């Protein structure tokens, strides 16, 4: 196993030249520096570690280093350089896995003054250097101040323009931090046993003799990096074709909403000063004094003035128009600013910045696009589809396949409660109408009330919120929950074993529950440490971890089987991963025939995961074929 | 004809090992026909562990558990079960025994547990001859209709006395016990005891129990499908800490260390622990 | 002699379709909720080529050799498979089963050849306790 | 010694609820080391090695 980190001229989007790179080999216990005229030998040294059957350690390698050296080897040396996933390790990925929390631990490091506040909780290489005591300085700062003591000014992102011996020295500096952070991650005896040097071993022994979560996260991070490079095709004209229908409506409404109110329907310090003059008495306030002015209360605001009352719905539309504009046409997001020259949006994704499960998406958040049930969402969802590019060569309309996890949340509960009811509740899922059973069990009037109950009750809603479902308060809530526990004993006993797994005894002392903690981490499905939580609720943490870890393995096995079936991944191939959303995925497909294979494969892949972890409940998927996202869901 | 009938209605008696997950991850539990072998160092939790499952199975997932405690009267086993159900060391307290009786709290717990009419036991103690248990063990399974039969301590053979070495009695008994299990389709959990090694520190102070150190030429390593083993150093910093080790699993074949557990001196339960040596 | 005929077929069924039907509760559940048993089953055992032993309840020596002969002769089988041959259950009272297996092996060898069937039998291994044993290498 | 090695013709190994046994290597380098072994306890059924102890030869116990 060798440890490295590289230095290029810019990001992966427009990287042109390779500057330097250092390779520390543990068998020789000595570093090796590479220069612009040594890029060829650098690629050979990495291939040699692959030929021996070892491993290559990069920081942010799955997302940057490895794909950039594939791109850089194509334009500079014109060679096919491709690192296999199995022979690659990303310290950044393990850091987010092993140190998913840090929130706690970083507090003392912050109190110590050993961590910059700008580098709080960051998994960046420099952020970890201060944590381990290996930061002698940063290349960006020893460059800025040294440009002063030389003359020339500074450009926001110019320290990577040209190769200099100080970068070569700080390139080594990034490797020794990568090395020390790697060893800091290998010293956690819950993911890596106390065997031997896990550097000394080959990749075949590495993945299997390590905790399973280690392997999944590197397969997930490798897979998601491909999806970002694939990107999600974007119809610029269509979204532009939305802005006037919103902006003209915004301008026309603003005119009408200034004739009703003389001398901005967008701020809370505005309407509070205005609406409290038309006779509206705020019922619910906020923890800072100001009254609540959300969608809920506005629907119920009643004023004697007919014009003011009718103007409320015009404010309701205004805020929503601003919302769509504020998501589709604003500044520094808006999708329209993120459209790359290939007509696609490359939305980034953090493998699992959320302790339990489900990645985080940003620049732009591809997971918060308005659904087809929300206003103007039909047009918005239509703007996302594989139909925006009809094949990279053949001109063949690419069709989209959208596959989601059928009621994954409730099925995860049946598996963990199958420990107390012997597959009873799991069979009620298969029999169908689990919301009908929960309705009978909790004695609710309508099935829809049971649907919003089972999720609310499971996820820690108070007795008022439960009572407010049927139009009541905490009175009906307590009896609605107590009745459900009696009719479904397994759920109640489930919340016992959990409450007695992380607590020894609890006690209230002047405002704080003083739990005598037995463990501050629930074991997941792969064996990982899953957050710490704090109070009585925890079941929500267990279920969302199960489903997302199911989906993570699901989307990996799906792509693995599709590749195993011969289907090439990419826009120049048969399919391309475009988006992963919670329990659903959107996959571009070159032909309808291929799209059918994707749907069937996703269902078949769902069985390996369900079989692997011996899930007591049946995992299933449903696929929808069509041009865009408004059709596939 | 039988396979369609079996596979459609099959396990269906695959149960659910509680107290610690990981045992389920490597064994998926027991089948209707299999025989679970539970063992550990003398008095380290053999009786305690199996007693939790019988309770657990016979309460939450309404299964009919049959009990055959040959070293303790039926009254003592009920005492533990009653205390175990209500998370209390009902034995380990002269006050608690006196308590629940005078305020009428005994009948409360009693109806709560045995009310579903699930737990059934055998009274004998008088040596209990081999075909004076197997006949009755079948009577539960068949007459009372039990899904799981529990036989604590399998060194009390006592049958056809006059043949050198009871090394055959344990084998002959195990074969008849194993046979009975599948021909009726019952989950059979049996507890045995280990030989005293005297070749180093012995069991109660550490020492992993392999497959050879039990009886070596054992038949119980052959007839029994799954073998659960408990290890704990009661002379260490963690006497309550117990290691669970799968010694055999005909079903999965996945052996090794399952997980850990902690003996709650308050509830007498084996709550799952957090450990990785 | 150590698993139910439904389980042995279960292995055969899964093995035939290149799958781990046993280890998967989902795949068991899959093929049930659509009658897929009949599909794979008729594909496999439909040729009436497989015959097995069902009892568990103590197979005595000439209460096994009798039954093993029934296939060969009555059912017309060409291959007989005997799993685990440390299960004797016969003439208990003769110290050390080292003699029982010898008496058994000769009769098993006899029946096989005098009829011309193919007899495949599985035995186990003495635990050496003399080095690294079987599970960790050792020829 | 095995539970069978206990004295008598066989009433003390049967008619005895709790049987406490002490082991000490009164020749060699251990002697004063005493091991406590529970051979039987019908009242509990939990047998085995309890712990170790010995009050130094200076003052008995």
Adjacency order of strands in the biggest sheet of chain A: 3-2-1-4-5
Shape of chain A: globular
Distance between the termini of chain A: 45 Å
- Note the total helix count of chain A: 23
Provide the CATH superfamily of the largest domain in chain A. Ribonuclease H-like superfamily/Ribonuclease H
Largest sheet of chain B, order of strands side by side? 3-2-4-5-1-6-7-8-9
Which chains share the greatest interface?
B-C, 35 and 31 residues
- Helix coverage percent of residues of chain A? 40-55%
> What string, H for helix and E for strand, traces the elements of chain B in order?
HHEHEHHHEHEHEHEEEE
Task: Provide a compact summary of the structure.
This is part of a larger assembly, with one copy of chain A (633 residues) and three copies of chain B. Chain A has 633 residues and is an alpha+beta fold.
What this model shows, in words?
Chain D: It comes from Escherichia phage T7. This is part of a larger assembly, with 1 copy of chain A (633 residues) and 3 copies of chain B. By secondary structure, chain A is α+β, with helices and mostly antiparallel strands. Chain A folds into 4 domains: 1-232, Ribonuclease H-like superfamily/Ribonuclease H (Nucleotidyltransferase, domain 5, 2-Layer Sandwich), CATH 3.30.420; 233-343, Up-down Bundle (Taq DNA Polymerase, Chain T, domain 4), CATH 1.20.1060.10; 344-406 and 519-633, Alpha-Beta Plaits; 407-518, Orthogonal Bundle (DNA polymerase, domain 1), CATH 1.10.150.20. Helices cover 47% and strands 11% of the residues of chain A. Chain A has 23 helices and 17 strands. Chain B has 277 residues and is an alpha/beta fold. Chain B contains 9 helices and 9 strands. Chain B has a 9-stranded mixed β-sheet, sandwiched between helices. In chain B, helix 8 (167-184) links the parallel strand 4 (148-152) and strand 5 (187-191). In chain B, helix 3 (46-59) crosses helix 4 and helix 7 packs parallel to helix 8 (167-184). Chain B is globular, with a radius of gyration of 19 Å. The B-C interface holds B 2-4, 6-8, 10, 14, 28, 31, 33, 163-165, 168, 172, 175-176, 178-183, 211-212, 216-217, 219, 222-223, 225, 250-252 and C 2-7, 9-10, 22-23, 25, 28, 32, 37, 41, 54-58, 84, 86-87, 89, 92-93, 95, 124, 127, 129, 133.
């Amino acid at each position: 196993m060798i440890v490295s980190a590289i230095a290029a001229n810019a990001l992966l989007e427009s990287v042109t030249k390779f500057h330097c790179g250092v390779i520390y080999d543990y068998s020789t216990a000595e570093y090796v520096s590479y220069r612009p005229s040594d890029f060829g030998a650098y690629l050979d040294a990495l291939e040699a570690e692959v030929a021996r059957g070892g491993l290559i350690v990069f920081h942010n390698g799955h997302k940057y280093d490895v794909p950039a050296l594939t791109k850089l080897a194509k334009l500079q040396l014109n060679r096919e350089f491709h690192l296999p996933r199995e022979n690659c390790i990303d310290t950044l990925v393990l850091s987010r896995l092993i140190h998913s929390n840090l929130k706690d631990t970083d507090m003392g490091l912050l109190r110590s003054g050993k961590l910059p506040g700008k580098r709080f909780g960051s998994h960046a290489l420099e952020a970890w250097g201060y944590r381990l005591g290996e930061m002698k300085g940063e290349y960006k700062d020893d460059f800025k101040r040294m440009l002063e003591e030389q003359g020339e000014e500074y450009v926001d992102g110019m320290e990577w323009w040209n190769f200099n011996e100080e970068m070569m020295d700080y390139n080594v500096q990034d490797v020794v931090v990568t090395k020390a952070l790697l060893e800091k991650l290998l010293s956690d005896k819950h993911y890596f046993p106390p065997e031997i040097d896990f550097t000394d071993v080959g990749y075949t022994t590495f993945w299997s003799e390590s905790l399973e979560a280690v392997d999944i996260e590197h397969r997930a991070a490798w897979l998601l990096a491909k999806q970002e490079r694939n990107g999600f095709p974007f119809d610029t004209k269509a979204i532009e074709e939305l802005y006037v229908e919103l902006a003209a409506r915004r301008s026309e409404l603003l005119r009408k909403l200034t004739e009703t109110f003389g001398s901005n329907p967008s701020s809370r310090d505005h309407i509070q000063k205005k609406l409290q003059e038309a006779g509206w008495v705020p019922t619910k306030y906020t923890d800072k004094g100001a009254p609540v002015v959300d969608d809920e209360v506005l629907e119920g605001v009643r004023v004697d003035d007919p014009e003011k009352q009718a103007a409320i719905d015009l404010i309701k539309e205004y805020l929503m128009i601003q919302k769509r504009i504020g998501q589709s046409a604003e500044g520094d997001k808006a999708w329209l600013r993120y459209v790359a020259e290939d007509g696609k949006i490359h939305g980034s994704v953090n493998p699992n910045g959320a302790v339990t499960g489900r990645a985080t998406h940003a620049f732009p958040n591809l997971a918060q696009i308005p659904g087809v049930r929300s206003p103007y969402g039909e047009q918005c969802r239509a703007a996302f589809g594989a139909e925006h590019h009809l094949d990279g060569i053949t001109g063949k309309p690419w069709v989209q396949a959208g596959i989601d996890a059928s009621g994954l949340e409730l099925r995860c509960l049946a598996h963990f409660m199958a420990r107390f009811d012997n597959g009873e509740y799991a069979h009620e899922i298969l029999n169908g109408d689990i919301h009908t059973k929960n309705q009978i069990a909790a004695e609710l009037p309508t099935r829809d009330n049971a649907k919003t109950f089972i999720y609310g009750f499971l996820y820690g809603a108070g007795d008022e919120k439960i009572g407010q479902i049927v139009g009541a308060g905490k009175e009906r809530g307590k009896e609605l929950k107590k009745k459900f526990l009696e009719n479904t004993p397994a759920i109640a006993a489930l919340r016992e074993s959990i409450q007695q797994t992380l607590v020894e005894s609890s006690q209230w002392v002047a405002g704080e529950q003083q739990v005598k903690w037995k463990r501050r981490w629930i074991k997941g499905l792969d064996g990982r440490k899953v957050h710490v939580r704090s109070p009585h609720a925890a079941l929500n943490t267990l279920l969302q971890s199960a489903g997302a870890l199911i989906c993570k393995l699901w989307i990996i096995k799906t792509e693995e089987m599709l590749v195993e079936k011969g289907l090439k991944h990419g826009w120049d191939g048969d399919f391309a991963y475009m988006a992963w959303v919670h329990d659903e995925i959107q996959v571009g497909c070159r032909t309808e025939e291929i799209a059918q294979v994707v749907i069937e494969t996703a269902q078949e892949a769902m069985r390996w995961v369900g079989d692997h972890w011996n899930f007591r409940c049946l995992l299933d998927t449903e696929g929808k074929m069509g041009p865009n996202w408004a059709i596939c869901h | 004809e039988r396979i369609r009938e079996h596979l459609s209605s099959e396990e269906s008696v695959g149960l659910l090992f509680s107290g610690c997950t990981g045992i389920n991850d490597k064994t998926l539990g027991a089948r209707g026909g299999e025989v679970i072998m539970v063992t550990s160092g003398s008095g380290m939790g053999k009786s305690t562990f199996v007693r939790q499952q019988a309770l657990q199975w016979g309460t939450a997932m309404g299964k009919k558990v049959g009990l055959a405690m040959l070293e303790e009267s039926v009254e003592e086993t009920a005492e533990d079960l009653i205390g175990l159900h209500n998370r209390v060391r009902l034995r380990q307290s002269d006050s608690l025994k006196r308590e629940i009786i005078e305020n009428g709290k005994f009948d409360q717990w009693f109806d709560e547990l045995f009310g579903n009419d699930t737990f059934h036991l055998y009274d004998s103690f008088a040596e209990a001859e081999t075909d004076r248990l197997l006949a009755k063990l079948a009577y539960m399974r068949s007459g009372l209709g039990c899904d799981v039969i529990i036989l604590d301590h399998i060194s009390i053979v006592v049958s056809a006395s006059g043949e050198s070495d009871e090394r055959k009695m344990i084998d002959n008994l195990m074969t008849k016990l194993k046979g009975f299990a599948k021909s009726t389709g019952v989950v059979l959990v049996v507890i045995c005891h280990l030989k005293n090694p005297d070749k180093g520190k012995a069991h109660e102070e550490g020492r992993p129990v392999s497959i050879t150190d039990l009886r070596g030429s054992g038949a119980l390593r052959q007839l029994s499908d799954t073998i659960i083993a408990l290890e704990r150093n009661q002379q260490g910093d963690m006497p309550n800490l117990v290691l669970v080790r799968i010694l055999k699993c005909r079903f999965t074949g996945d052996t090794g260390i399952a997980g850990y557990m902690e003996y709650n001196k308050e509830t007498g339960w084996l709550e799952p622990s957090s450990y990785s040596g």
